[PDB]
Amino acid sequence: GIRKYKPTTPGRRGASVSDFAEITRSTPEKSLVRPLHGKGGRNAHGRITTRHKGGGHKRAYRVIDFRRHDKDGVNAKVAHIEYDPNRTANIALLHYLDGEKRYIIAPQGLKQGDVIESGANADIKPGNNLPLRNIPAGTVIHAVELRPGGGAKLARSAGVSIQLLGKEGTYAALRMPSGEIRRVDVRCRATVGEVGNAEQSNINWGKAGRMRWKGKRPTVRGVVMNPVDHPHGGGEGKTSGGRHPVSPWGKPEGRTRKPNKPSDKLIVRRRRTGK
Amino acid sequence: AKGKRTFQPNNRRRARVHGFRLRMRTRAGRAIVANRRSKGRRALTA
RNA sequence: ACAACUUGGUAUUGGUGCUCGAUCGUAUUGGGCCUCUAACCUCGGACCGUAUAUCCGGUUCAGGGACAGUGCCUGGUGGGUA
RNA sequence: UAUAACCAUCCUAAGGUAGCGAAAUUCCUUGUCGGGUAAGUUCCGACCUGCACGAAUGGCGUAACGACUUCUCAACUGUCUC
RNA sequence: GUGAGAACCUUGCCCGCCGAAAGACCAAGGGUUCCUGGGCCAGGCCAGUCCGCCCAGGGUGAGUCGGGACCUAAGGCGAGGCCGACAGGCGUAGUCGAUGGACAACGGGUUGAUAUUCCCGUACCCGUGUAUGUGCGUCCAUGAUGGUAGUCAAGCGAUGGGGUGACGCAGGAAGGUAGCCGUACCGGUCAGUGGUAAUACCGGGGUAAGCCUGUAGGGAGUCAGAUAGGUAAAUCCGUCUGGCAUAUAUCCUGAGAGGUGAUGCAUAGCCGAGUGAGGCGAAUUCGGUGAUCCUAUGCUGCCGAGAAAAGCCUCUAGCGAGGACAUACACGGCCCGUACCCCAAACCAACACAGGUGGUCAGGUAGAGAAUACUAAGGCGUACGAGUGAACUAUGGUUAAGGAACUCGGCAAAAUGCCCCCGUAACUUCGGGAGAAGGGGGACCCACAUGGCGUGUAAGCCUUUACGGCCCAAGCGUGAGUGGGUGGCACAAACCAGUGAGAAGCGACUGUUUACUAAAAACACAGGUCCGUGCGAAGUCGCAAGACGAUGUAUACGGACUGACGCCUGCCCG
RNA sequence: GCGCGGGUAAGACCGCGUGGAGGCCCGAACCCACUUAGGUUGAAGACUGAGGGGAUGAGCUGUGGGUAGGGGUGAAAGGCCA
Ligand SMILES: [Mg+2]
Ligand SMILES: [Mg+2]
Ligand SMILES: [Mg+2]
Ligand SMILES: [Mg+2]
Ligand SMILES: [Mg+2]
Ligand SMILES: [Mg+2]
Ligand SMILES: [Mg+2]
Ligand SMILES: [Mg+2]
Ligand SMILES: [Mg+2]
Ligand SMILES: [Mg+2]
Ligand SMILES: [Mg+2]
Ligand SMILES: [Mg+2]
Ligand SMILES: [Mg+2]
Ligand SMILES: [Mg+2]
Ligand SMILES: [Mg+2]
Ligand SMILES: [Mg+2]
Ligand SMILES: [Mg+2]
Ligand SMILES: [Mg+2]
Ligand SMILES: [Mg+2]
Ligand SMILES: [Mg+2]
Ligand SMILES: [Mg+2]
Ligand SMILES: [Mg+2]
Ligand SMILES: [Mg+2]
Ligand SMILES: [Mg+2]
Ligand SMILES: [Mg+2]
Ligand SMILES: [Mg+2]
Ligand SMILES: [Mg+2]
Ligand SMILES: [Mg+2]
Ligand SMILES: [Mg+2]
Ligand SMILES: [Mg+2]
Ligand SMILES: [Mg+2]
Ligand SMILES: [Mg+2]
Ligand SMILES: [Mg+2]
Ligand SMILES: [Mg+2]
Ligand SMILES: [Mg+2]
Ligand SMILES: [Mg+2]
Ligand SMILES: [Mg+2]
Ligand SMILES: [Mg+2]
Ligand SMILES: [Mg+2]
Ligand SMILES: [Mg+2]
Ligand SMILES: [Mg+2]
Ligand SMILES: [Mg+2]
Ligand SMILES: [Mg+2]
Ligand SMILES: [Mg+2]
Ligand SMILES: [Mg+2]
Ligand SMILES: [Mg+2]
Ligand SMILES: [Mg+2]
Ligand SMILES: [Mg+2]
Ligand SMILES: [Mg+2]
Ligand SMILES: [Mg+2]
Ligand SMILES: [Mg+2]
Ligand SMILES: [Mg+2]
Ligand SMILES: [Mg+2]
Ligand SMILES: [Mg+2]
Ligand SMILES: [Mg+2]
Ligand SMILES: [Mg+2]
Ligand SMILES: [Mg+2]
Ligand SMILES: [Mg+2]
Ligand SMILES: [Mg+2]
Ligand SMILES: [Mg+2]
Ligand SMILES: [Mg+2]
Ligand SMILES: [Mg+2]
Ligand SMILES: [Mg+2]
Ligand SMILES: [Mg+2]
Ligand SMILES: [Mg+2]
Ligand SMILES: [Mg+2]
Ligand SMILES: [Mg+2]
Ligand SMILES: [Mg+2]
Ligand SMILES: [Mg+2]
Ligand SMILES: [Mg+2]
Ligand SMILES: [Mg+2]
Ligand SMILES: [Mg+2]
Ligand SMILES: [Mg+2]
Ligand SMILES: [Mg+2]
Ligand SMILES: [Mg+2]
Ligand SMILES: [Mg+2]
Ligand SMILES: [Mg+2]
Ligand SMILES: [Mg+2]
Ligand SMILES: [Mg+2]
Ligand SMILES: [Mg+2]
Ligand SMILES: [Mg+2]
Ligand SMILES: [Mg+2]
Ligand SMILES: [Mg+2]
Ligand SMILES: [Mg+2]
Ligand SMILES: [Mg+2]
Ligand SMILES: [Mg+2]
Ligand SMILES: [Mg+2]
Ligand SMILES: [Mg+2]
Ligand SMILES: [Mg+2]
Ligand SMILES: [Mg+2]
Ligand SMILES: [Mg+2]
Ligand SMILES: [Mg+2]
Ligand SMILES: [Mg+2]
Ligand SMILES: [Mg+2]
Ligand SMILES: [Mg+2]
Ligand SMILES: [Mg+2]
Ligand SMILES: [Mg+2]
Ligand SMILES: [Mg+2]
Ligand SMILES: [Mg+2]
Ligand SMILES: [Mg+2]
Ligand SMILES: [Mg+2]
Ligand SMILES: [Mg+2]
Ligand SMILES: [Mg+2]
Ligand SMILES: [Mg+2]
Ligand SMILES: [Mg+2]
Ligand SMILES: [Mg+2]
Ligand SMILES: [Mg+2]
Ligand SMILES: [Mg+2]
Ligand SMILES: [Mg+2]
Ligand SMILES: [Mg+2]
Ligand SMILES: [Mg+2]
Ligand SMILES: [Mg+2]
Ligand SMILES: [Mg+2]
Ligand SMILES: [Mg+2]
Ligand SMILES: [Mg+2]
């Protein structure tokens, strides 16, 4: 759900927050959590790799299972849905019949007290897994594997979805969330359904602290920048920089995909903005 | 009303920043200690 | 001038097939395209060195593949730097 | 009596739509008109003659807020005649 | 008083100051500044008998306090290895790294310097030896079996598995305790004045850890079978079938109360005895107020969603014939830190400096207060002095009538200022604007009034009777209202303690910036649009591996311009 | 949010008791440096006396660690780097 604050202080006017009507617990299993440390956005050398990224709040990582082929043909039960900051969407706790406990992304429309099939010949119930070769055409899927035994490395954010087109030989066609079409071996695994919590977009923050806790630092505009540290800097007054916009490091906009990539001569087409 | 000055003593910091083990860990440290010994200073390294 | 990017040739560099020419079938040696696997490549899966190893190496399975990358010569953009 | 409030002349790409205007923009300027005290080159509200306003280096408003800048009112006092 | 010298040294008596410190301590910081004894050519902004001057000697006591022998993080090193013309950059296994976790002692006395260290009294935690008592097997053999034979459950038990250990922000209620204020009670005083001789006044009105009991309160579920999930095996942890359960059942925890520690210790005081020591040595009941401390890792709300290892318990794997428990006796318990200085003449500042320095203790009266005023415990009069109505300078105080007429400028000053009552505009994004302006009251005594309220005992009621729940004469504390009377110029009397309104410009607000002339109309800030990114991504640092982006996947990430919200965002592709 | 009395058919809505969300308000320490007088061979190689803003947060501070000069860092002033 979505809740909107009633304005009572100048800073909070227009703020909103997502109503967590889908959570059942607020305590991850002690055996499945692993620690994590504040990182700061630097690297081994210590140079600032990406500007204005830092600060925030201490977070504890929880392990997730993106393999889902070690266990096959054994049913599972949906137990609980848990809070998770590390990724945009919510997650679910699974109880396998043999007794193991495991974690997966919470698909849209799922609720407590249900049955999930993970067999290679399982049903079309949402949240199930089975190889691309065995999925009927026209269904919506997520957690796509870029290739067999590679783990779900695509379409993991909230509200994303993939649509399955026809099939050919060992190849299948997928509609990318951004309109692209890509081919992948049918031997890989995937999951039916889409990521829930589709109301992520409508969140209005309106407060500096709500960004600082997440760890976003100011941006400092270009024109105000002094000429030495910037290409637009300098000038008396304020101007457009006296030169067509260029990155702060000398290289302008335009082509950004490295040509002659092994996928360059195999993949079909590119995006089109705002059709 | 700030009057805090540059020097803030601490034996641990001073030692671990200008300690013998740190100095001789690398090469330039060895070269400089050799130079100081050739000069003939009373105390080699602080 | 240099870095970087970028174009060809050449060595790494293999086999079989369609298609274009300079002493309509007769002679021309280089281009364009499709294929095969053993060179080579994959921060793909599984085992061993291994008691503890997301390092590394080896075997095998699975995919790319004579491309890409990298040596040598060269044409272009190039206040990013001198 | 007041001027263009339509058409055509050159050019190139077209020759300022809404909105506002002696302003943090106005040299000639203390421009002209109404308000303020006896005196107002400051200020407030209008007049378009826009040297050289103008809609993503945004325009006009706007509740609350400002150790931001300018003006007026009552109480005060050694800031003054002293 | 000392000595030749004294306002600056020692003793005694007055006066003032500090007292959220100008006091009592910790860590960091210095090293002999600590005590005893010697002197005063060097130093102390002057003289010095004095010293943080120096001389000579002396002084620092831990099985339990802080560290190491116990464990870990951000990070550093790095056997192999990768990359690199050489030099060199990376990172695995491991070992290093407290500001953390676990871990066993308290009260009093003592010398010129030491005290949870010595002594007195009583405790707690690990190890070895001897003796004794419970007492179980190896060699007999019952048993359970899977029922002739083969294993075995004793006792240890992991480098292995599983539990526990193990964690955010804000908030009140309830029961407690410390501290403080009175009182029963106990000892002492006659303070040269008008009056009180005990009904006055002064002084007391204490005492740890552990060990026993387990109140209030809070939290939790248990047995039979199947199973194979937990890098082997599992009586362990899970999951699935049924039974048992709302019982204050059972267990755990646990404040506070009560007994023990204690015929002990200490103290107000009384005797002799004075650089001071010795001896004796009373009473120790009841109420109010009330915490920043305990129950409490409790309970209730909120999202921005909140360390690891070790230890402890358990499981088998595996070793195994001596081991476990209890009592007594006699023993061992390792290395370093330990004086003095700590809100400063001993640290940081070239000085015996008007600056800074992390943390712990917090009395009384007025007070909302840890502000402000005077004060106890406690410590200070801090290092040039004595006199003298010059102008002038600086900090205060006062001043008739006008009140802003000076000054670019209401700069500085001045003024209001607190508590309780009546009603508060144009506006608006319906929260606000709003303490808007303004008007009235504020002392004491008595009566209402043994009024009311809270607490709470004698006493009463009730019960699963105990450390129990209810009311509560007496006692204690405490405001509110209505009348009458009294004093003065002034009744928030000191201190402390917001000017307000009407416009315009600029910026949406809170925020950050040119240490050391500029705090803004500057910067960022939440909103939007465009561009780019298909995942060892783009973008990076790095000639290379590699690392970030991300232990993420376009309802995301990198770059650019704009800046809440409302009405909108024209023409032109040379 | 909750419970009670109204309104509805249910509401919105109207009052009544609990809650303390507030980058909320007045005000100590701490932190900042706006105005003003002094100092300027100062007590101080950038302070003092009066007034001045935050005080539950983009807060303040201790402890140990990383960032090296054509470079670091920088809510961006040509600041800082003993
Ligand atoms: Mg982890
Ligand atoms: Mg380097
Ligand atoms: Mg950035
Ligand atoms: Mg931080
Ligand atoms: Mg999520
Ligand atoms: Mg906000
Ligand atoms: Mg920026
Ligand atoms: Mg700037
Ligand atoms: Mg330049
Ligand atoms: Mg620079
Ligand atoms: Mg400029
Ligand atoms: Mg200009
Ligand atoms: Mg511009
Ligand atoms: Mg450009
Ligand atoms: Mg794209
Ligand atoms: Mg070539
Ligand atoms: Mg070649
Ligand atoms: Mg050859
Ligand atoms: Mg050029
Ligand atoms: Mg140049
Ligand atoms: Mg004007
Ligand atoms: Mg304007
Ligand atoms: Mg003009
Ligand atoms: Mg002008
Ligand atoms: Mg004018
Ligand atoms: Mg004027
Ligand atoms: Mg102009
Ligand atoms: Mg524009
Ligand atoms: Mg435009
Ligand atoms: Mg305005
Ligand atoms: Mg006036
Ligand atoms: Mg006067
Ligand atoms: Mg004297
Ligand atoms: Mg004082
Ligand atoms: Mg005080
Ligand atoms: Mg103070
Ligand atoms: Mg120290
Ligand atoms: Mg020391
Ligand atoms: Mg001494
Ligand atoms: Mg002497
Ligand atoms: Mg002398
Ligand atoms: Mg001297
Ligand atoms: Mg001496
Ligand atoms: Mg010792
Ligand atoms: Mg390492
Ligand atoms: Mg080595
Ligand atoms: Mg290494
Ligand atoms: Mg270490
Ligand atoms: Mg440590
Ligand atoms: Mg002691
Ligand atoms: Mg939390
Ligand atoms: Mg909390
Ligand atoms: Mg007394
Ligand atoms: Mg006790
Ligand atoms: Mg089983
Ligand atoms: Mg309290
Ligand atoms: Mg011992
Ligand atoms: Mg020692
Ligand atoms: Mg001592
Ligand atoms: Mg000392
Ligand atoms: Mg000391
Ligand atoms: Mg001190
Ligand atoms: Mg010095
Ligand atoms: Mg001094
Ligand atoms: Mg000082
Ligand atoms: Mg301080
Ligand atoms: Mg206090
Ligand atoms: Mg005083
Ligand atoms: Mg004192
Ligand atoms: Mg003078
Ligand atoms: Mg004066
Ligand atoms: Mg007077
Ligand atoms: Mg006057
Ligand atoms: Mg004049
Ligand atoms: Mg004037
Ligand atoms: Mg003033
Ligand atoms: Mg107003
Ligand atoms: Mg109001
Ligand atoms: Mg008011
Ligand atoms: Mg009874
Ligand atoms: Mg009862
Ligand atoms: Mg009077
Ligand atoms: Mg304007
Ligand atoms: Mg502000
Ligand atoms: Mg700012
Ligand atoms: Mg600055
Ligand atoms: Mg400056
Ligand atoms: Mg400065
Ligand atoms: Mg300034
Ligand atoms: Mg500023
Ligand atoms: Mg400003
Ligand atoms: Mg700004
Ligand atoms: Mg916009
Ligand atoms: Mg944005
Ligand atoms: Mg854009
Ligand atoms: Mg790349
Ligand atoms: Mg943009
Ligand atoms: Mg703007
Ligand atoms: Mg702007
Ligand atoms: Mg065009
Ligand atoms: Mg064109
Ligand atoms: Mg409240
Ligand atoms: Mg105020
Ligand atoms: Mg002076
Ligand atoms: Mg200096
Ligand atoms: Mg000052
Ligand atoms: Mg001051
Ligand atoms: Mg003043
Ligand atoms: Mg203040
Ligand atoms: Mg203020
Ligand atoms: Mg505030
Ligand atoms: Mg703040
Ligand atoms: Mg260095
Ligand atoms: Mg600037
Ligand atoms: Mg400097």
Q: List, as one string, the DSSP characters of A127-149.
A: T-EEEGGGSPTT-EEES-BSSTT
Going by C-alpha positions, the residue among A187, A199, A136 that lies closest to residue A163 is A136
Residue A238 Cβ under 7 A from any strand D atom: yes
Residue A147 beta carbon within 7 A of nucleic strand C: yes
Reading the block at residue A30, the tokens are 């002690």
**Across A33-117, where does the E strand assignment appear?**
33-34, 61-62, 76-82, 91-96, 101-105, 115-116
Measured in angstroms, the resolution is: 3.3
Question: Residue ranges of the alpha helices (H) in B1-45?
Answer: 11-17, 20-25, 27-39
β-bridge partners, A129 = A191
Rounded Cα distance, B21 and B31, in Å: 14
Strand E positions within 7 A of protein Cβ atoms? 28-30, 73-75, 77, 87-88, 90-91, 162-166, 227-230, 237-240, 303-308, 347-349, 355-356, 429-431, 508-510, 516, 522-527, 530-542, 546-549, 551-565
Edge-to-edge strands, sheet with A129-131: A129-131, A189-192, A140-142, A162-168, A171-175, A181-185
Nearest nucleotide over every DNA/RNA strand to the A217 CA, judged by C1': F75
At residue A85, the 3 state secondary structure works out as coil
Whole-number Å distance, alpha carbon B29 to ligand 101 midpoint, is 64
Q: How far is the CA of A168 from the centre of ligand 71 (A)?
A: 101
A224 touches strand D (CB under 7 A): no
φ/ψ of A35, rounded to 5, equals -70, 165
User: Could you tell me if A226 and A235 are in contact, meaning their C-beta atoms sit under 8 angstroms apart?
Assistant: no
Residue type, A201: S
Method: cryo-EM
**Does the nearest atom of strand E lie within 7 Å of A260's Cβ?**
no
Rounded (to 5) percent helix, strand, coil in chain A = 5, 25, 70
**Residue located via tokens 């043909």:** A73
Residue A10 contacts strand E, CB under 7 A: yes
Question: Strand pairing of A76-82 and A91-96?
Answer: antiparallel
Report angle CA A43, A44, A46 to the nearest 5 degrees.
Answer: 65
Which residues, at least 6 apart from A121, have a Cβ–Cβ distance to it below 8 Å?
Answer: A130, A134
